[PDB]
Write a protein that binds this DNA or RNA. Structure first.
Lengths: 331, 323, 323
DNA sequence: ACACCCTTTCTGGAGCAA
DNA sequence: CATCAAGCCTTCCTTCAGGTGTTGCTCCAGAAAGGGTGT
């Protein structure tokens, strides 16, 4: 089953790339040493072979959300919105290992090297949730394959293929957003501002005195840590139309129905990260099932046999498969 | 819960963008070198994708207030207007670290590399203020999600939803506003204007000769600079979002929104730059704002009323307590 | 606390907008080159989002005086006849750096990066003058928030918040006023007017020869220029906001507003521009202004009368003192 | 009864570059 | 209805933040002996 979810982020996208990146105040990424630089936390970037100029494929940077992040977003969406309410409305409860296996593929960091029986493998791949995300102590193949969230851009034209010339994007799609943390105690202004503080003016003056001592120590170092922190993070600019490729090799109809229910409940979900700055908010503007567009304003339109299958399976959903899926053979 | 606080700024909005940007005496932003240049401190602006050629969408600038700035504004009006009167009214006094953890995210720049217990996580995410704003030494996630203040503009037409198209403004929304600082010794002009000056005439003469020696070869008070601002009267929008909130947390947000009328947005405090009025507040798509404040949402106001009653310092203390 | 000072300019207003703008003899601001352009210093203009037609908001020009000019003007009137008399009737001697920091917010152009102690911050924000205007070497935040002087105009309709539905000026509020400088000795006539010039006719004839050599090909004299001014007789609006003031500070601002009529708003000093009367002062919405100054707000006046007594130089000295 | 299936059971070393 | 005026100076940024914690892999890559039991 081929599912293609074209979304539109209405907030910036921030999937933080690991690394030690810096930036000048003017906006130059990774400056040579000597000039003053601030920590930059770049967004996640996929190198893509693309056609720059004419017939000259080259590796260009295109900033994305990883398929692991979107796979866990899909997993936690169908978990918080479908699977957990189905378990709550009945008497079924999960162990902490079963909850850990359902949310992160495993209960412990150490798997057991023995694989499970063919009957249990077949029944877990027939399961609506466990078939999508087959983890556990004995590693199963989950039939859900989740691609990265690619922005519909020229740099991904060898990724996107034909049919994506509408709402086209060129050029840079990222922006460095600067964030500052000020010291609260420097923003104290009067005795009315300080009355909620134990000690008041004495404690405030002690905070200024420790900041002056630490500043003198840092000046002796240059020529603990305070609360001033001016820094930067690169985000992907809002308003982009993104492609999200979801694949299912011979799924049970309830499993693709569960993916459809999760895509229905992607409303009020954040894609990558930067929670407190409301980053990752998005609007789905299209879902195509095997190339057939099945999205409307009121969620998924059509595809009814998937929804009846997943409703019947959620009615038949229990905690027994989750418990014996997470049960280690070595334990 | 999805709140849309659509506001209109009375005065020019100035959130100072980082960078050594420059301006000529005309309206040329960042000129080529070899011409007379002045330091320009531009407004904070966000690139947004917008339909510019009626088929082609492109990354265009749009001057905003950052969601960090508006989040700290909401946090500070909650603290100085709701939380601190409830704390000093009941006699509760936070520690200096607890005050720093209330106004910033924590008290120290080094967070603890341990996770807190689930009982603690549940108590603070059920707490109104600490549930809205996480952080601390052990990296709590708040339930509040604060977007940038976006102007209702055709550059943001892919950013806003529906119903804003009749209000959507086109064209440039900024101004290079010029400021200057005199050396006020040059403005003295009289021998009875130096009787307040110690030394008097000889002191004013020494300041003049020091300025002349500095100009012949420390920085004086003569400054001429510029800052780009968003134009006043612009209609904005502010997307506050709530990840599974308690009704007390929503009531704390609405209590903050009721008394942001005397609060300033971003920078320009001496120029009264941050002044604004709230045109509307949509509470999950339903309008709850009027002239007197937020009407309706009564369960949220009652929940934050019973939550502000019994608000103790010890929750902030063991939120700020390191490990 | 919100103060709304509604003034009406008696003479034209000229706050010169920076920029080499040009004018033709029949109007046509900033023409294409070759139509004999004349130098034009336009008055200060703020772009304001405004209703241009039914359902369309555009960034229109609106001629204002910037809030920095108003902030320094308020600082200067309190310094000129409330603060300096309080220092020299008591014999207090401000330093020259203290005078610089009082009249301009700083003594030098290099603020200290170190923060001041909280007791110092509390004393200066509780100070009547230093609380209004902060700054200094360690960058104090003042309690005063001075808006720019908008006119009562329909272009400012989104600025005023529909407080005044009458007296709304619709058309343009500006005139290009032309000023020319005559060469003095081009109008002598007789040799009795040149007998005071040393040498007599020979020095004026040498100056005429130098002017001729300049005209065939060093700057001359008798230039022709234009300056856009706001037309007189219209009604303005001023907003002076306060960040939790002591009543001595409110009394200081009202004492500035009482004898505000002696000073000028920006202007050309020679042309007597910037003259104005105050038609009203709104203290948080209630009118406290009459023909005989300010009537009402008595506790602010008693507080500022208490604070002017005992106002020593010592606070100014350790406000301007740089670490 | 002879075929596949499901379990145990069992002996030794140990350093490591790109 | 024609020119003559058809700017001049000077400002032309200041300090500071200029990251913190964690993560820092897991497992298995055998074949026979000795029991069952299912066709």
């Amino acid at each position: 089953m081929q599912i293609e979810v074209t979304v539109r982020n209405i907030t910036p996208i921030f999937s933080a790339a690991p690394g030690s990146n810096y930036i000048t105040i003017d906006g130059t990424i990774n400056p040579p040493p000597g000039v003053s630089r601030f920590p930059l936390v770049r967004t996640r970037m996929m190198y893509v072979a693309a056609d720059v100029g004419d017939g000259v494929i080259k590796s260009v940077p295109l900033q994305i959300v990883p398929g692991n992040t979107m796979r866990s977003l899909l997993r936690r969406t169908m978990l918080k919105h479908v699977i957990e309410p189905a378990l709550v409305e009945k008497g079924n409860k999960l162990s902490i290992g079963a909850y850990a296996t359902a949310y992160s593929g495993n209960a412990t960091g150490n798997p057991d090297g023995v694989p499970s029986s063919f009957d249990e493998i077949a029944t877990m791949r027939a399961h609506p949730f466990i078939g999508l995300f087959g983890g556990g102590p004995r590693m199963l193949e989950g039939r859900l394959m989740v691609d990265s969230l690619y922005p519909i851009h020229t740099n991904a034209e060898r990724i996107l293929g034909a049919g994506y010339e509408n709402e086209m994007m060129s050029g840079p799609i990222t922006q460095v957003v600067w964030a500052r943390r000020m010291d609260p105690i420097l923003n104290l202004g009067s005795s009315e501002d300080v009355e909620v503080i134990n000690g008041g003016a004495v404690a405030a003056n002690g905070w200024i005195q420790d900041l002056l001592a630490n500043s003198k120590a840092a000046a002796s170092k240059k020529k603990g840590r305070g609360l001033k922190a001016f820094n930067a993070h690169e985000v992907v600019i809002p308003g982009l139309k993104w492609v999200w490729r979801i694949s299912l090799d011979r799924p049970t109809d309830a499993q693709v129905g569960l993916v459809l229910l999760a895509l229905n409940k992607m409303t009020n979900e954040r894609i990558a990260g930067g929670h407190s700055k409301d980053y990752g908010r998005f609007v789905i503007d299209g879902v195509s099932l095997n190339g057939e567009q099945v999205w409307s304003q009121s969620g998924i339109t059509g595809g009814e046999q998937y929804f009846d299958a997943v409703a019947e399976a959620i009615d038949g959903l229990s905690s027994k498969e989750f418990e014996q899926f997470a049960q280690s053979a070595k334990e």
